[PDB]
Amino acid sequence: QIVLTQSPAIMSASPGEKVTLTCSASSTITSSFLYWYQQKPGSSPKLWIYSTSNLASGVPARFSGSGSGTSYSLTISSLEAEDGASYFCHQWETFPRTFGGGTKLEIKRADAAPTVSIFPPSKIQLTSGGASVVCFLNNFYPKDINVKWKIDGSERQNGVLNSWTDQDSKDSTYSMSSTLTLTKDEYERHNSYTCEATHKTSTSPIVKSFNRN
Amino acid sequence: QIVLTQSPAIMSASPGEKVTLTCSASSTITSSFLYWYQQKPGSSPKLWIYSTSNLASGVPARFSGSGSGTSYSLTISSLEAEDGASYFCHQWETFPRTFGGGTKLEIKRADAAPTVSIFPPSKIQLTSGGASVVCFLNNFYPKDINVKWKIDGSERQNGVLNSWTDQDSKDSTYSMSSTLTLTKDEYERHNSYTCEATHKTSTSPIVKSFNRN
Amino acid sequence: DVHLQESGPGLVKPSQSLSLTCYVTGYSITSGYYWTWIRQFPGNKLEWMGYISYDGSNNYNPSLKNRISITRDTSKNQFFLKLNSVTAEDTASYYCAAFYYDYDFFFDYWGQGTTLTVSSAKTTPPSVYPLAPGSAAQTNSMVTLGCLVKGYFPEPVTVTWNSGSLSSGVHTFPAVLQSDLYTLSSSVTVPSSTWPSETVTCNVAHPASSTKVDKKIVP
Amino acid sequence: DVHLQESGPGLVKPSQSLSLTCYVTGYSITSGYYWTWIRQFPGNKLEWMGYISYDGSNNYNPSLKNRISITRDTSKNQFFLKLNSVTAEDTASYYCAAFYYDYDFFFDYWGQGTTLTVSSAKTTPPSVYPLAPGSAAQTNSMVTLGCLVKGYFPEPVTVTWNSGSLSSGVHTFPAVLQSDLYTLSSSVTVPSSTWPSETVTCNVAHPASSTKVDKKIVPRD
Amino acid sequence: LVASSGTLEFITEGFTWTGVTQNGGSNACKRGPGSGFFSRLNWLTKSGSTYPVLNVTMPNNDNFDKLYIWGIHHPSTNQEQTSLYVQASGRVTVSTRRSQQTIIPNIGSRPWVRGLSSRISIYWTIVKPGDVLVINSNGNLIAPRGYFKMRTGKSSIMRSDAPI
Amino acid sequence: NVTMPNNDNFDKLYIWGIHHPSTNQEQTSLYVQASGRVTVSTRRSQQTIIPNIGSRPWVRGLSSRISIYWTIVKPGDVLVINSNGNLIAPRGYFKMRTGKSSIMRSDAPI
Ligand SMILES: *[C@@H]1O[C@H](CO)[C@@H](O[C@@H]2O[C@H](CO)[C@@H](O[C@@H]3O[C@H](CO)[C@@H](O)[C@H](O)[C@@H]3O)[C@H](O)[C@H]2NC(C)=O)[C@H](O)[C@H]1NC(C)=O
Ligand SMILES: *[C@@H]1O[C@H](CO)[C@@H](O[C@@H]2O[C@H](CO)[C@@H](O[C@@H]3O[C@H](CO)[C@@H](O)[C@H](O)[C@@H]3O)[C@H](O)[C@H]2NC(C)=O)[C@H](O)[C@H]1NC(C)=O
Numbered sequence A, B: 001q002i003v004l005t006q007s008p009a010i011m012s013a014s015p016g017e018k019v020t021l022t023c024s025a026s027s028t029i030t031s032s033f034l035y036w037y038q039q040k041p042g043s044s045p046k047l048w049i050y051s052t053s054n055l056a057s058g059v060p061a062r063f064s065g066s067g068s069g070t071s072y073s074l075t076i077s078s079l080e081a082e083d084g085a086s087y088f089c090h091q092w093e094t095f096p097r098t099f100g101g102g103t104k105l106e107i108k109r110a111d112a113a114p115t116v117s118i119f120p121p122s123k124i125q126l127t128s129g130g131a132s133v134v135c136f137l138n139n140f141y142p143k144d145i146n147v148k149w150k151i152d153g154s155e156r157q158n159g160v161l162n163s164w165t166d167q168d169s170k171d172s173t174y175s176m177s178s179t180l181t182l183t184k185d186e187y188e189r190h191n192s193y194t195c196e197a198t199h200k201t202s203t204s205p206i207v208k209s210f211n212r213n
Numbered sequence C: 001d002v003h004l005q006e007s008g009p010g011l012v013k014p015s016q017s018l019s020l021t022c023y024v025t026g027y028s029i030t031s032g033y034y035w036t037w038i039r040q041f042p043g044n045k046l047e048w049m050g051y052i053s054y055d056g057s058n059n060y061n062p063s064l065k066n067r068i069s070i071t072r073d074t075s076k077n078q079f080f081l082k083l084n085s086v087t088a089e090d091t092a093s094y095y096c097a098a099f100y101y102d103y104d105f106f107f108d109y110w111g112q113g114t115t116l117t118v119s120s121a122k123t124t125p126p127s128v129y130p131l132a133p134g135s136a137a138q139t140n141s142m143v144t145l146g147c148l149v150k151g152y153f154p155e156p157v158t159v160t161w162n163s164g165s166l167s168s169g170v171h172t173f174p175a176v177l178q179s180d181l182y183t184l185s186s187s188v189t190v191p192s193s194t195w196p197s198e199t200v201t202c203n204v205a206h207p208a209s210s211t212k213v214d215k216k217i218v219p
Numbered sequence D: 001d002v003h004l005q006e007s008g009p010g011l012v013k014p015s016q017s018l019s020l021t022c023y024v025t026g027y028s029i030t031s032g033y034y035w036t037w038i039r040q041f042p043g044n045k046l047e048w049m050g051y052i053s054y055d056g057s058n059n060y061n062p063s064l065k066n067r068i069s070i071t072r073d074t075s076k077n078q079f080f081l082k083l084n085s086v087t088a089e090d091t092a093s094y095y096c097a098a099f100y101y102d103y104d105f106f107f108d109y110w111g112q113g114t115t116l117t118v119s120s121a122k123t124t125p126p127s128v129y130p131l132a133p134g135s136a137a138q139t140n141s142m143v144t145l146g147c148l149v150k151g152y153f154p155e156p157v158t159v160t161w162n163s164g165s166l167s168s169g170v171h172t173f174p175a176v177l178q179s180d181l182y183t184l185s186s187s188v189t190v191p192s193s194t195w196p197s198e199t200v201t202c203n204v205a206h207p208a209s210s211t212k213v214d215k216k217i218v219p220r221d
Numbered sequence E: 001l002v003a004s005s006g007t008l009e010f011i012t013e014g015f016t017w018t019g020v021t022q023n024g025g026s027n028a029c030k031r032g033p034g035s036g037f038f039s040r041l042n043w044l045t046k047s048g049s050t051y052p053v054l055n056v057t058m059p060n061n062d063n064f065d066k067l068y069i070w071g072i073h074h075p076s077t078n079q080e081q082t083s084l085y086v087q088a089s090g091r092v093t094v095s096t097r098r099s100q101q102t103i104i105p106n107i108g109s110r111p112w113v114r115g116l117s118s119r120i121s122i123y124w125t126i127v128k129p130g131d132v133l134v135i136n137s138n139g140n141l142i143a144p145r146g147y148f149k150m151r152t153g154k155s156s157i158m159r160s161d162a163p164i
Numbered sequence F: 001n002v003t004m005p006n007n008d009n010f011d012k013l014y015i016w017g018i019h020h021p022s023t024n025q026e027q028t029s030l031y032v033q034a035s036g037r038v039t040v041s042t043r044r045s046q047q048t049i050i051p052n053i054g055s056r057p058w059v060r061g062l063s064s065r066i067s068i069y070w071t072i073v074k075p076g077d078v079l080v081i082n083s084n085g086n087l088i089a090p091r092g093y094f095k096m097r098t099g100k101s102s103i104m105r106s107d108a109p110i
Helices: B121-127 E078-086 F022-031
Strands: A012-015 A020-024 A034-041 A048-049 A069-073 A086-091 A104-107 A115-118 A130-140 A174-183 B020-024 B034-039 B047-050 B071-073 B086-091 B115-119 B132-141 B174-183 C003-004 C021-025 C033-041 C044-046 C076-080 C094-097 C114-118 C127-129 C148-152 C175-177 C181-185 C202-206 C212-215 D019-025 D034-040 D047-049 D070-072 D076-080 D092-099 D116-117 D127-128 D148-152 D176-178 D181-187 D201-206 D212-213 E026-031 E034-036 E056-060 E066-074 E090-096 E101-103 E121-129 E133-134 E147-149 F002-006 F012-020 F039-042 F047-049 F065-073 F077-081 F093-095
Touching: A086 A104, A086 C003, B047 D076, B071 F022, B071 F047, B115 C202, B115 E056, B121 B132, B121 D127, B132 D148, B132 D181, B174 D181, C021 C033, C148 E133, C181 D076, E066 E133, E101 E121, E121 E133, F012 F039, F012 F077, F047 F065, F065 F077
Parallel strands: A012 A104, E026 E034
Antiparallel strands: A020 A069, A034 A048, A034 A086, A115 A130, A130 A174, B020 B071, B034 B047, B034 B086, B115 B132, B132 B174, C003 C021, C021 C076, C033 C044, C033 C094, C094 C114, C127 C148, C148 C181, C175 C181, C202 C212, D019 D076, D034 D047, D034 D092, D070 D076, D092 D116, D127 D148, D148 D181, D176 D181, D201 D212, E056 E133, E066 E121, E066 E147, E090 E101, E090 E133, F002 F077, F012 F065, F012 F093, F039 F047, F039 F077
16 A cells, blocks of 8 residues: 655656656655666666665666655756656565556657658558558657648548657657548549648648649 | 887788897887887777787787897797788887887788779769769789879879778788869760779789770 | 566456466576566556565465465476456556565566457457558658558557668557557658668568568559 | 777867867776877877876876876866967877886777867868769679768768678778868779679768768669 | 774775765664764775776875774675676775785675675774785775774773673 | 696695786786686695785885795695696795704894
8 A cells, every 4th residue: 555656757858957756655665665667668667776775787877866754766967868768666665565657758859840741542451442541740849749631621530540659769759640541432532632740840730742743 | 318210110021931020229228118019000009018028918929029228129930911010119218208110011912913993973973063083903912003094095194193002901902092083074075984004913904994885 | 697588378358367477597486586477557557466485385465366366386497477357457568577675785687578468359460551652752852661550459569671670760659449450550761762772671570460471662 | 988088179270279088987097007198190100298197187298298288087087188289290190098017017008099180271071972883884793882082171081881781892092182172982892793782882971070971882784 | 903902093084986986875784864884984886887996095104003994895696796896706905015915705695684685894904104005996895984093002801791 | 737746755845826916907918817726735635726816005116916825745645736827836845854943033143
């Protein structure tokens, strides 16, 4: 029943700032049964601090470590592209080992727009009664963007599906993916198929489809 | 204040000879403040002998070492392609640390010819007003060779620039490089462009250009 | 050091029994360390499932005893999981690890981890369709290629480029799930020019269905 | 990174001030060893510029003190070089290193080294044109390719092949200087046939001008 | 000898422990509220991602014998080392013009004492006036913060439960 | 791996040693192996030493040094030296008398 709650839960900063995650706790835990794990996507939690304030066999200096009562900490001298990840404070006081949520860490970078491209449903994909029209919106800033699928005309929901990805390695950018799936027939209905990327970047929604002669 | 002079300054020998470098010295140095460095192009002096006579962490057996008063030495059991480079005796007696010149060491091998090739100026290179016609003359023997740029007709200087390289790794060969630069126009003046490689190898100057279509 | 390898089915239907397995190598799981199982849910939430130390049949599971149940096989030097009757609530990433513990020191080992998916629906092969810009071009700079994976289940699949050689510039999104099937896309990007010429293909693999197929891109 | 890294500008105008830097990694330059700067001129002649041991602000420079002046930053564990007012005479390769010393022993560490150029010319990005045999062939054996770097300054630039994969059979010639610009060429050599098929590119790099660009040898058969 | 010297008067000379993390702390040697250590001792661990080789010289110019109390650390797991000292095998060396003694740590598993399963070995070196002390470790050094004065006098120590 | 037996009818005294370098490179430099090792034994004896690389104070120039050790082999026993570096081997044995001698620190003149 221990109750650990790391604070920002999801947050960002810049290459150089003094980042600081916290982690409360139902009851009190002795200053050597609390740890922190640094997990990146595709990995598995990697140990980062034992006994409340000691860095594991690899961790770089920028990472201080602290905590007393039912309240602990993390902290970074500066902040590096690299340091961008999620952290979980672990506890070992009482028997049902706990973790709580975690605090994700996006970083400060650019502010720049997407790079789009529209796609035609395969000859294969077609020969199946299916018509998948996918539109990529890569390496843009702010995780938030908004597309719109047109064809000949269209503003609201249709039959699209999207799935953004996590802040890139060295880009610390993002990419998203809308995909339009229709009946082979309903597709050979018109030959008008636009994708509308709307961003904080510019006011006029970078459009893409077949913008040429 | 204390000048060192290594003797051959530039010299050669063959794979198997007993090579021997010297190094004089303004005044006297105590047999343990004189060292030797083995530098190869693109590297940085690598230590080779300390205390006047002990090989440093790696040097191979074939290198003996010595030196007494104001005069020292080097020496090699045999001589391998590899050992081919330049050397500098260092001195640490008196405070203005010295080094003197060095004794280069070219090697012996074959007597063999170049392998030549002629090149057209880039579609790009062109689109800039420039016309660079480059001719390579690779891995031949004696560092001495003499090209002649022809075009339609030509024996003397024109607008060519060259730059040979140093004795290769395992080839102990050389390569050179003339390069013809002209005005896009003056290049689109004729369509004849021969490069003439002349060597100790054969009497008839290995020509290359467009000896076919 | 010590090594640990998860193991078991990629899925099961709500109710049967789950039965993971970890293979340790470099330490008699009877010589110290608390061999545990830890999993995290789709939401990325680490939840401690319990252990079994050198202490023997101790286990000393969590607060979901009801079924988290563990074993060890000193001969084969390996330990296991059960979890009995499972739901869809139980679908997640199952990991096994060992911890050290000291009052002044701590130190663990984990594992590649195995994905289990608890659902009714059936293991069902995916189909791969290539994404080329074909028709209209609009370039004079870097080009982008696709290649999408649709209609598959149970997770997970793995996508590449020319056998992994094309690493940089590719974004493989998170498959999106709909009515018992997954559908994802990858997003390579070769030089402004360099491609038409060069051969470029994605390599799709679905362990689940023994499916390994590539689909070279062309205009 | 875990030894010595030189650093600083690729150039400066005769008279200003040069300011090198060495980043040591693995030893408190306050724990023994004499951290020195050594440079060799175009003619390939190593010259002892001086030091500064653990002994602190000692420096114990050479016989050209007038300007050779050294510093250390214990905190960052790094030491520097000044040389003050410089001429063109002073243009060369600057190396930093550490020596051991013992009457019966000696042992050193050096560095990739930095090239500084003293001139008043303007740093200027290079252009990369590719050398293919296109037109006429004349083969039935190994083929050779080019790729040349023209119109760049201050030195230096680095050339390669398919990201360094093609190491053997390539010659990169000494860039030739003319009217404030260098122009060099590299010379790869793939198998008799094996090429047209396989992709092949040279990777050109000009630190001095943050220029990094490659140009695949577009077969022009 | 400490008994016969009869004085724990400590000079606190300062070393330059550049490139490692000073002032250690164990939950078994706590100082009031949290972790702590031995008053007269300094516990060094990695810098951030490493442990350089330490080479500190501390001469003795006073006219009296100086007594140095230092030691080495013994981890429990081959990884506990890695964890702390980077190098997989420590090394400590304390010498003078006439002295010299070198220790290597033993990695292992001792019984559980006050939480900890690893421990430390305490050593001593005295340097006579007109001689220097030198420490050279590449791991596990539990360095000293200074020297204890050395008296000759007429003192001793006794085990006794008699009340004064 | 050397062996040197004792056939004579008297106790032989061997004085040998091992060398400790200043840097992990002064070893490499001199003994190749990154970690010396010396062993001197007999049928009843045996003693092995491993060098402690490091920095001793500057003495007579040198910052490294040697560790002196001794081994006596009783008649009808063999001596065995086995080092892979840093061995400062001996050139022979000293004779061993029993007699009535000693040593004294004194400045008085004879
Ligand atoms: C090698 O084996 C020994 C004993 O087999 C290990 O020591 C034991 O370590 C455990 C923790 O790993 C200690 O357990 C704790 O004991 C206390 C005291 O009774 C209890 O309050 C705790 O809840 C927990 O049970 C145990 O004290 C300790 N036993 C002894 C006597 O040493 C040692 O850690 C093993 N080392 C490795 C690397 O496997
Ligand atoms: C470890 O540290 C010690 C001291 O910090 C280093 O020893 C010092 O080494 C230098 C040369 O490397 C010796 O310098 C010479 O001293 C004489 C004596 O006055 C002087 O005539 C010479 O011109 C020169 O300055 C110095 O004596 C010596 N000091 C002592 C007490 O040892 C040692 O070399 C360091 N080891 C490493 C590998 O860093």
